[PDB]
Structure formats: structure tokens, C-alpha cells
Amino acid sequence: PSVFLFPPKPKDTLMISRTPEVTCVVVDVSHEDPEVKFNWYVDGVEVHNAKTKPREEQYNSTYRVVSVLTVLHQDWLNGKEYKCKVSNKALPAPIEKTISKAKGQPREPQVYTLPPSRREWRKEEVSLTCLVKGFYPSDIAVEWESNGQPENNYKTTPPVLDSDGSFFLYSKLTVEASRWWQGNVFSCSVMHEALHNHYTQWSLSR
Amino acid sequence: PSVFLFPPKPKDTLMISRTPEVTCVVVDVSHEDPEVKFNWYVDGVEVHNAKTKPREEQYNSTYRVVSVLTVLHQDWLNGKEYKCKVSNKALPAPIEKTISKAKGQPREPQVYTLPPSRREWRKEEVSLTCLVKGFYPSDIAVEWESNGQPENNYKTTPPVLDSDGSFFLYSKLTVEASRWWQGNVFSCSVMHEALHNHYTQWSLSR
Amino acid sequence: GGPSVFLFPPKPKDTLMISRTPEVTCVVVDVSHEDPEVKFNWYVDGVEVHNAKTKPREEQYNSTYRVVSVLTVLHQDWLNGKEYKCKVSNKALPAPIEKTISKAKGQPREPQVYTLPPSRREWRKEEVSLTCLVKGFYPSDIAVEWESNGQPENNYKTTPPVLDSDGSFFLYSKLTVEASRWWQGNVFSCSVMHEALHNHYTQWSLSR
């Protein structure tokens, strides 16, 4: 079989109501020896403490077993390393795969909101756009909200390498011309590692 | 025979980058019989993880044993209850003081930016006021920043109860008239459990 | 050792008005069900007076009593930094407890009173709020009321005094009116009262 390790999603590591989760999937375990054993090393330390939890089954005449390891918000941010040992009988000698924060030199993203072009003002649907430039690591959380409730019709591009050894992106919230001109205000919310408070909100009004 | 239980500081619970802590102390108890045995329980279930401290002798002739358990932001946010236990033969009565998050319906605050009064104009230092009202519980963190850097001449007030069982407070950002008249933006940051993603940020300039 | 004596200054609005008569209050909590008689002695700067109207006791659900004595003081004496002593004597007391309250000593600084209109996003709300900011006073003793065309308002609480980096305080006070009431253009008036004011009083209006 083959092993893949995945980082916590980037809104899990900075919010207080979520639990960050490194998940370890195995993909090609046969119908012959489909038993799996997940041994988690945190920086050489062995962790059944943080409850790992395999709970999954197969497809494609194979077996896809994933293992989720709860982590602490701080430890993921403080460079701690997380290993995963998988002990299946088809494979010769155990597979160990690693994952860590991002190494790197953190970079604070500048966040600017951009009112829609005047060529789409008197259409049916304006497009508010919010650009975050100059961040590192490549992992951010861009969402929109308006009047304390979420907004759900917005699409963020991928992060893009700059020549400044940092990343940018654009999120575009499409909202009806009705609400734009009602005076309603919509906000761009960025969660990043390197922000003070991990958080910033910038408003697009009038 | 006297112990006390103190809850985590509101700000330590609103920021992944801090650690909440519940504090059990002993005072006016340890006389000729020390060795207290703290037993911590998280919503009934047993927990070690706790780091009690050596004893401190005052001129009260007594001693002071303090035991600090670290709290997880989600448990607290979900009102989980934490327990304490007893010393030696000096106490026929077990001590089981227990503390939880403020119980009751949560209410998100409304946070408004207010500019200086016209009467303030031309004075060397001008004031910026943020009004935050309608929250519950009183767990809240206010912070003025400019350019993502936090200000140093802000002062927040105690949260006061309203008619509607709500809270409000104010935060005054004293700032030299130059930085204001120039056009620099200042902005206050409120972290509270009932906000969307538990953060908000309203900016202000003129 | 059990019976605890707490002393309280007069309410600010009673000291700052020449007509109202202020009242320092010496309360004793946690006196026994079995020694319920307690003696109140009041000293004014060292000379004991006899305007103490010691109240009747009150059995508290602690299975203890709470006993209160109130001494009637003067607009000039409390304001001139006088010191009022309350010597409390019960049989259960290892020491006849003496407590001493006085006006905070220092240079009176007159408070500057800014009125701050509803924020623009509150205009979309049903009830707008008018913000008074009393700033730059000492001592902390102060009183803030709101008025409308000469009639009080109802919905207003006031932020307790907050220390300032220059040994002064500030406070805030919000009054909540209907959106209707603000746009009809009524005048609302923040009445402040601090010792260092012309007749201890001042007032500022907010409209439009």
C-alpha cells in the first residue's frame, strides 16, 4: 500500500472552537492483509495520548484506512514534528512519513478591500474583491461576512507565489447591486499565522 | 479549612496563542499536617495534567498550596466543569469546589467606532472611542491597533450590565493629534465567544 | 474575627448638592445570633458627635445579623477633607474595630464633558445610543444624569470611573433612545456633577 499524511486545515489551527487534525490515509491495502497499525510519533515522543482514530473501509478491490490525530493549536504552530508508522504485512518494513508547520520565515499579509469597478456598478450584481498580499507560509483562511452573519457566494483563488518570496490571492464576493447600494457593508476576514491576534477584518461599505 | 477556585482569565480563553488555567489554592489550612492531595475532574471524568506547586509559608503561621490545571479552549467554551479535592486528617469534610463557564444564553456584541468630539479638535492629544454593547457572557477582549501594531495608550473599562441583561463597555484610544489629522487608520479588535469566528474588527480614520 | 465592619462614603449626588444631606454608613456584617447588641461610636476629626441613626438589626440567611448605623454629614465638612471614624464594639470582637473614611486627598481637577453622537451604523438600528464621556477629573466622585427637554430619561447606565495615565479618571455614559426620537431632532442633555465645577454642575446637549 501507499501512505499519505495531511496537515490540519488552516482554520482549525487558529480558531478556539475547532480541533486541528493531522490525518494519515493508507490507500492500497489488499484484501489479503488488510490489517493496519498506526503509530504516531510527535518529535520522537509516542502519542496514543492524543486519541488517534481509524474508522474506515474500502473501495476499488482495495482498502482506504485513514487515521486522525488530534493536536494542540500551539504545538503545530511551534514547529513540532509528527510522524506516522504503518505496520501492514504486505509492505516489507514499516513506512514512516513526516509533517511539520512550514519551516520558513513568517510574513504578515497586507489585506486590502477593493470596491467593484464602475463598469459593473449599475448592473445586477457587483463583485467585491479583497486582496491579501505578502504572506508566508502559503496557508491562510479568507472568508467574507456582512452584518455579523456569514456570506456564502464568494470564491478565493489559490495562493500564488510572488517574486517577493511570499504569496498573494484574491477573494471575490458576488453580491446583488441591491445590497451594495442599500448601504450594507461586507467584510473580508483573514486568519493567518503571522497576524497579530491571528486575525484581521477589513470593511467595504457605501 | 478554607480553599478557593479561580477561573481562567477571559483573554486566555479567546486566543489559541494563550493557555487558560484554573487555580486551586489552599490557605489557613495547612498547620501541622501538610501534604494536600488535589484531584481534578473534567465534567466528572478524571484528569491528571495538573501541576501543583510547593508550599508557601506566610506570617499567617499557615501555608499556601496552589494547584494550577490547564484548560482547553473548547471544553471551557462548552461549559465543562472542573473539580478539586482534599488534604489530610485536618479536614473531616471533603472540598469539592467546582467552576464552569458563565451559564446562560450567549449574545454577540455590537461594536461601533466613534470619532473625536469637535470640541477635542486642536488639543495635542485626541481620543477615539469604541462602543461594544449587547454581549453575554462578560468574557471579552478589546484592543486598539494601528497598522496591525497594537496601541499603547488605550484603556478599557469594566463591563457593566444593561437593562436587557446585556453588557457594554467603552475603550478610549488617546492618540496625539498628528497621527489622527494626518489620516492614519486606527481600529479596535473585540474577541468574544458569540461573534462570527469569535473575532471582529472595525476601523476608523478621518 | 467574625464581625466585619465596612464603612461607606456618602453618595456623590448628596455631597455635591447644597440642599441634600449626605450620609456615611458604617455597616457590620456577621455578628452572632448570640451577641446581637453592638455599639456605634462616631468621631468627626477626633470629636465624637451624636447624629448616628443606628438602624434596627436584620437577621440574614447566613444565620447572622447585619447592623447599620448612618451618620448625617455636611456639604462643607466632607468636601473639606474631614475624616469620619466609626468605632464598632461587640462582645465577640477581639478589638473594638475602628474605621475611618474621608474624601480623597488631592488637587481638584475639573472634568471636560464631550458628547458623542450615535455612530453611523447604529442609524440602521431601532434604538440609537448617545455617548457622554466625562474626562479628566479628580477625585473619582462624580454623578452623571441625562435629561430630555427638562425631563429625565430612563435607559441610561454609566461606566464606573477608570484610572487615566495622569492621575485623573474618565467615565462613559450611554443613553438609549428610539431611532424615531433622534431623527425628530430632540435635544438630549448630559448632566455631569463633580466637586470642581461652577455650583458643582454642568450640562451639555446632543441633537441633530
Add this chain to the structure above:
Amino acid sequence: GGPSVFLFPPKPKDTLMISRTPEVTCVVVDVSHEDPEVKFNWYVDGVEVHNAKTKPREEQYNSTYRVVSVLTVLHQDWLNGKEYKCKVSNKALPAPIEKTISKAKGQPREPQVYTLPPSRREWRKEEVSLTCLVKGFYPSDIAVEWESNGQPENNYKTTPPVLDSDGSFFLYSKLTVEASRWWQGNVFSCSVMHEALHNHYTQWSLSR
């Protein structure tokens, strides 16, 4: 035995413009040292084609070879969605590997190009960022360039096109300008190239 094969389409500006010549490029990676012969059968919609250009071998930092092939398409032929199939024949491979690239079958949409001046909180910044929003197009074959006054501004990056709720596409460009260039009146243009255009080109200018 391990050879891996890919098929990359001609570039958009390679297409759309009759002055440029578009080519489909098949690249074969991980070819053996002992077995270095790769054979490229080229087919265009099921007919054999010998237009097939160079087969120049290259060397990489392992026991691996990299052999690429280039086939010249006709702008009309690509823009008519012909399937381009290529067949590689290593001795390490028992059954040849094939791969087919073609255009995206669907109805084209014209791009909508919105030029946006930088936000206000960038105005005191050393540099200023001009951004170009290209909305609602199909397929995702579009080119986006910049030019301030005839010569081509070269300090820009573009996001990959990402899919909207319509099933249309949108992307962004970002010109980074030194603030003085912007503040004097220099006019910057976001030139765009797509298939569903007239003459396959527009350009909207922006200065302030």
C-alpha cells in the same frame, strides 16, 4: 517499467494569433539508460500525422532520460477541438502508452475585464498594486498582459483561472508599481486575449 508520459496543449497566445504558431508537446520522463529509444506516433483525430517535429533527447540528474516531441497544430484545428493522440514505444513498455489532448468542448463566453485602482490604505505605501479582474469566460484559455504607455510593464503576476458558480471562469492580474509612476498620471493597460473575442483581443486602460 516506469516511463511516465504527459501531453501539454499549445499556449493561448500561441493560438488566437496567426503570427505565432501553436504546438502540442508530448514529454516522456523516466526513460532507462540501457533502453533509451522512444518512438512517437502522432495522430490528429485518428489520422496519422508526420508534421511531428523534433525528437531531441535530454539528460537529467538520475539514471533517467527526458525525451519531448513537438507537433504543430493549425489555430483553426485546435480551436475546432480536434483530439491529438500521441503513442510512445519504449522497450520498457509492453503495450504503448497513449495520451490525447484537445480543446475544451463547450460554448465560448466573452471575458469581462474590470480594472480596479488600489485601495486607500495603500496610498502611503512605497509601491502601489494595480489589479485586473477578468470575469465570465470559457474555456480557460486566456492571456493577460500589462503595458504602461506602449512599452510592456513587466512586474506582474497572474492567478490561475478558477471556476465560478455559472461555470464561467475568473482570474486576476496584479501589477506592482512604484508609487511615483502612479501619482504622476501614467496610464497602465491590462491587455487581454481570449478566443470568444472580436479579433481575439481587447485592452482597458486605467490611470488616476
